[PDB]
């Protein structure tokens, strides 16, 4: 969750998504783990 | 650590890690350095620590 930040490394940041420096707007997150379990296999990422 | 190639990248975007923060330098640019009388540190503590 670290990585949605202007300016900021990692590889979601550098290679699935990526904002600019001069970003106006909100980020918002909660954790969903009731929703999003089991083994659950479908959610991908690029390395 | 002595007289070699270092490639950063692997180690910031292959992230097994929680915290990766750089100080006087930043992330992508280390890359691009050479270095001098380079060290590490390594220890064990507590989380909120």
Do not use: H
């Amino acid at each position: 969750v670290r990585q949605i930040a202007p300016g900021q490394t990692g590889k979601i940041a550098d290679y699935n998504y990526k904002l600019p420096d001069d970003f106006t707007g909100c980020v918002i997150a909660w954790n969903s783990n009731n929703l999003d379990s089991k083994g659950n296999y479908n959610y991908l990422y690029r390395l | 650590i002595s007289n070699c190639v270092a490639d950063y990248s692997v180690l910031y975007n292959s992230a097994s890690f929680s915290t990766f923060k750089c100080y006087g330098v930043s992330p992508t640019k280390l890359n691009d350095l050479c270095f001098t009388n380079v060290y590490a540190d390594s220890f064990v503590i507590r989380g909120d620590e």
